[PDB]
Symmetry: C3
Subunit: 394 residues, 3 copies
C-alpha cells in the first residue's frame, strides 16, 4: 500500500543525510525536492527529516547566503556532527542558480511538530540564521530595487523548467531550448557570477508568480519562527510588507488570473499555468479573488480527468504528457490544495488530494501524470511524490 | 447603434489631441474626463488615446507636479512632437485645483494593451515620472502629516460637485452655493496658492472617500507600471501601505458603509453616496465588507429602477434629477461594477453594466440619468459616457 | 426589565467618576471593566461615560504611559475639574501589571457619537495623547524587538485569569495557582519593575491572542481618532502594519484556529479558547479564515446550549462553571459578535447577542454563565454585563 511503498522509495533514494529525487540518479541533492522530501521523512524518522535540510545548508550554502538548486555531492553524507568547525572537510561543487524557496515553510513545520522539543529548538536555532541569509540573498541579488518581487534569471529556477510561460522570454536568449539554457549559464560564468551584472545583463529576467508566491509564504513562516525563537524579525517584516504588494500586483483582472511578468519585454506573460494558483498558498488574495481562482480550477476540471494540470487544458500550449506543459504534479497539487483549504474551498482541496492519491495508488510514485489518462510519466521512484503521499496522509 | 454613435461623439468633441467633455463647450480639457475618454479612444486609434493624456500632462502639469482639473487651452492642440524642449511654445492658463487621479490606472491599461509595444514603452516611460510627480504633489500638498489620506479643499475636487456629503462642510465657508465655491477660490489666491497655508487655513477640508479610493487604485497601478518598466517604486510603496490603512479607516461599522470625513468638524460625514462604493475599485475591503456593500447596493435597487444612484434613494437628500444628488452616472457605474466583479459579485457587476448600457441606448450619451425614469440629463454628447460605452463593450 | 435594571446596577456600583466591577467590592477601578462600562453609561449620561475614562487615566497612568489593571482608589472620585495641575492632589496606589487595551476603541465611539460636539472634541483631545502613551508603553515594554506582537508577563494581564491556555506556562513558574500568581508579582518587585529585566527574566511570557487582537483593534481606532483630530499618526501606523503581520501569524492552519504563543517554551499553545475568535474584532483575517472560525463557533454550539463558551466544549479542560474554563462571558460575546457581523456572519452575530441577552434576562447581571444550564455565576450586579446589555440594545 501507499505509505509503506512510499517509505521504500525514500529509503532506496537515501544517500545518508540527503535523498536523491528519483530512482537511477547520481548522488546529487536538489533544493526544492529536499524540502518536500523532509516532510515525508517526518512520517519515518524526525532526525532524518532534519538531517535532509541540515545537509542541504551545510554542504550547499555560500558565504553570501545563496542556496543552489543542486549540490553535487558525488557520495553519501553522514549526519551533521554538531559544532563541524574544528576539522577540515570537503565542500562539494554546486550549481550557480537557485530554486523555489519552500524551505522555511518546511522548517517551521519541523520545528512546531517535532515531539522532541529539545531537538526542535537546537535544529531550528541552527537553521534560522541560514534561512534568513538565504532570503536575504534572494532579495539583495534578485530584487536590488526593493520592489518586493524577485526575478529568476534562468527558467530552471522556477522549478517548472519548460513551463509554456517561459517560451517567449527564452526565445530572446542569444545562442533548441537546451542551447538557450546553456547559453544563459555561459553568460553567468562569463560575468563571474556577479549578481549586479547578471541582474543588469541577463537576457532572461522574469518575475515568476510561483517562485514569488512560495517565497512570500516562506517569509510569513520565517517570521513566525523568528517570533517563536525570540530572534529579531526586522528584515523579514520588510520582505513581508513589500511582498504582499508585489504578489498581488501580478493579478490580471481582465484574465481573472495571476501571471508571471517578463521584465525584459516589460509585459505580463499572458499564459495561465498551475503556478498562478500559488498565491493562495502565500495567503495574499482576498476571498473574491480566491473564488475566481476556484472557478477557474473547476473550469480546468471540465476538460481534464485529474486536477491540477500544469497548464490550462484549453491553452494552445497544453500537451498532456510533456513535463510542465499540461501534466499533473504532486507537489503543486499539494501546495494549491493547502491554499484552497485556507480560503474555505474544502471540496476543491479534497479533490486535489483525492486526485493526487489516486494517481499514486494506480501508477506508483512518478514525476508527473497525464491529466487525461492518468498515465505516470518521467522519473521512477520519484521522491517528492512519495514524500507528499506520506505527509498528506499523516 | 451604440459604438458607432459613441465614436461620432468623441470625434465631434475632439480638439486635436484633447477631447472636450460635452457638446457645446469651449475648447478646455478636464482631468478626470480625459482619463475616461482615453479609454474610449482605445477602440478607435491607440495613438489618439495616448495623445489625450500626453496633452493633459504636457500643457497641464506644473513644476511641482500638480495636475489641474481644467486646462484652459482656448484652441485645438497638435500631437506631442516628441523630445518639444527646443522651440518656444505657449503654456495655457489652468485651474488651481485638482480632480480624482484615475489617470495612472488608465495609463497602465494603455501600456499593457497597446498592440504596438515600442509605442507603449515610449509613451509609458515618458508619462511614468509625470504620474509619479502628480501622486507626489497630492501626498505632499494634501497629506502633509503622512496619514495615508489626502484632503480636498474644494467640493469640485471630488468630481462630485454638489454631492449631499459636502452640504454641511460647504455651509461653514464664509462669504447660494456658487458664492461659497467662489469664496474658496478667492481664499486660495489670497494665500498665493501656498499649499502649506491653504491646508492650514481652508474652511473646507474633507477626506473624500471617492478621491481617496481612486488614488489608492491608481497607486496600485502606478506600482505595477514601475515594476514592469524597471523604475524605482520606493515612493509608491509608501503611499500604498499608508493608503491601505487610511481608506479602510473610513468604514463605519454601525452604518455598514464608507463615509467621507470632515476634518474641519473632525467628524465622519454620515451621508451614503455612490462614492462610498469606490473602495471596491481600490481593492481594500475584505470580502465580508464587500458583501455588506453588495447588500446595500441591492437595497438601493429596491427603490431605483436603474443602478447606481449617486445617493441612497431613501436619503432625505435624494433628488432624482439633480447632478450628484441622486442621478446615475456612467463613470461611477463602471468603476463600481469593476470593483464588484473583482470581489466575485458577478451578477451585481453585470446589472450595473446592463443599466448603464440601456440608459445610453435609450437616451444617448448624457451626463447623468434619472434613476426612477431613466431620463437623460445634463450635458449632451457627453464624452465619458460615450467613451465608457466603447470601453465597456470592447 | 433589562435596561432599567442595568442602569440600577451601574448607579449602585458608581463611586462618583468610576464604577466598581460588581456588587460588594472595595472602591477600586479596573482597566478593561471601566472601558466596557463607559459604553453602558452612554445610555444614561454622556459626561458620566467620559468621566469613567478620564478617572482611569487621571489617577491610573504613570509618566511612562503605563495603565495598570487596578487603580486602588479607596474612595469615591469627583469629576475631572479641568486644567488639575494647579492644586496638590492624592495619587492612589495602582497594580504593577496591565490588562487588555480596549480603551481606544471605546474612546473613538464616545468621540464619534457624543451629541455634544464641543465636549467630544475637548475630551478626545485630552485623552488622545494619553492613549497614545499607553499603546507606546505596551509596545516599548512588551515588544522591545518590534515584532508587532506584545507579551503578557502574568496570566491576569489577559483578563482571562485561569484560561486553560495558561496552564502549562503557569506550571513553569518557580514558587496552587495563587502561589504562582504571587511569585510572579514578587519577581517583578524584586526586579524594581524594570521592563527590560522583567521581559528578559519573567518565567511567564506569552503572546496572548486576545490581548493582541484587542490591541490591534484599538490601534486601528486610535489611528482613526488621530486623523479626525488632525493629530500626528506616525507611531500608530507602525504598530498597525507590524500588528497585522503579527496577529495573522497566530493562525494555526492544521487546527483551523488562532492560538496564543508561549515564548518561554517557544511553542504555540494548542488550546482553543474564546480569545482565538477575537482577531475577527481586530479585522485581520481574510473571509475564508473568518468562515473557518464561523464553522468552529457553530460546532461549539452543537455541544453548548449558550454561545460562546470560553473554551471548546470538547476540550479536556472544559468545565461549565469555572470562570474562564468553559463559561460564557458577556464582554467576549459582544466583541466576537461585533467581529462576526463585520465579516458578514449576521446570523451567528445575532445568536451571540440573543444568547447574551437571554442569559441576562433570566439570571440578571452576573460575571459568567454556565453554557449548558445557563446558570449565572461569579460576581453579582456585574457591571460590564449590565453595561453591555445597555450598549448592545441601544
Ligand atoms: O527532480 C529534480 C528537478 O527535476 C526537474 O528539473 C523538475 O522540473 C524540477 O522541479 C526538480 O526540482
Ligand atoms: O465634465 C466636466 C466636469 O463637469 C462637472 O463639473 C462634473 O460634475 C465633473 O465630474 C466633470 O469632471
Ligand atoms: O472584574 C474585574 C476582573 O475580575 C476578574 O479578574 C476577571 O477575570 C477580569 O477579566 C476582570 O477584569
Ligand atoms: Cl477577504
Amino acid at each position: 500500500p501507499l505509505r509503506t511503498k512510499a517509505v521504500e522509495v525514500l529509503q532506496r533514494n537515501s544517500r545518508g543525510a540527503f535523498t536523491v529525487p528519483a530512482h537511477g540518479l547520481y548522488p546529487y541533492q536538489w533544493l526544492w525536492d529536499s524540502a518536500f522530501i523532509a516532510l515525508g521523512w517526518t512520517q519515518v524518522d524526525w532526525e532524518r527529516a532534519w538531517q535532509e535540510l541540515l545537509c542541504l545548508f551545510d554542504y550547499g550554502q555560500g558565504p553570501d547566503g545563496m542556496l543552489p538548486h543542486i549540490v553535487f555531492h558525488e557520495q553519501s553524507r553522514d549526519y551533521f556532527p554538531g559544532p563541524w568547525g574544528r576539522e577540515a572537510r570537503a565542500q562539494p561543487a554546486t550549481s550557480g542558480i537557485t530554486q523555489p524557496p519552500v524551505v522555511a515553510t518546511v522548517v517551521r513545520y519541523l520545528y512546531e511538530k517535532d515531539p522532541d522539543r529539545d531537538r526542535a529548538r537546537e535544529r531550528a536555532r541552527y537553521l534560522f540564521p541560514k534561512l534568513l541569509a538565504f532570503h536575504r540573498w534572494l532579495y539583495h541579488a534578485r530584487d536590488p530595487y526593493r520592489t518586493g518581487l524577485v526575478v529568476i534569471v534562468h527558467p530552471w529556477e522556477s522549478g517548472m523548467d519548460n513551463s509554456p510561460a517561459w517560451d517567449k522570454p527564452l526565445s530572446r536568449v542569444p545562442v533548441e531550448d537546451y542551447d538557450r539554457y546553456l547559453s544563459l549559464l555561459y553568460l553567468f560564468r562569463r560575468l563571474e557570477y556577479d549578481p549586479r551584472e547578471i541582474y543588469r545583463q541577463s537576457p532572461f529576467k522574469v518575475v515568476d508568480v510561483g517562485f514569488n508566491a512560495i517565497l512570500q509564504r516562506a517569509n510569513r513562516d520565517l517570521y513566525a519562527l523568528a517570533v517563536l525563537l525570540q530572534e529579531d524579525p526586522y528584515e523579514i517584516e520588510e520582505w513581508i510588507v513589500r511582498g504582499e504588494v508585489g504578489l498581488e500586483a501580478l493579478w490580471d483582472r481582465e484574465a481573472g488570473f495571476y501571471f508571471s511578468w517578463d521584465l525584459v519585454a516589460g509585459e505580463p506573460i499572458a499564459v495561465k499555468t498551475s503556478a498562478g494558483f500559488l498565491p493562495l498558498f502565500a495567503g495574499t488574495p482576498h476571498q473574491g479573488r480566491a473564488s475566481l481562482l476556484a472557478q477557474e480550477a473547476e473550469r480546468w476540471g471540465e476538460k481534464a480527468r485529474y486536477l491540477l494540470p500544469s497548464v490550462d487544458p484549453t491553452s494552445p500550449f497544453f500537451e498532456p504528457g510533456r513535463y510542465w506543459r499540461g501534466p499533473v504534479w504532486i507537489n503543486v497539487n499539494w501546495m494549491v490544495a493547502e491554499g484552497f483549504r485556507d480560503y474555505g474551498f474544502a471540496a476543491l482541496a479534497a479533490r486535489l488530494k483525492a486526485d493526487a492519491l489516486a494517481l499514486m495508488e494506480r501508477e506508483g510514485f512518478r514525476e508527473y501524470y497525464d491529466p487525461l489518462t492518468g498515465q505516470g510519466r518521467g522519473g521512477e521512484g520519484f521522491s517528492w511524490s512519495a514524500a507528499l503521499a506520506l505527509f498528506w496522509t499523516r
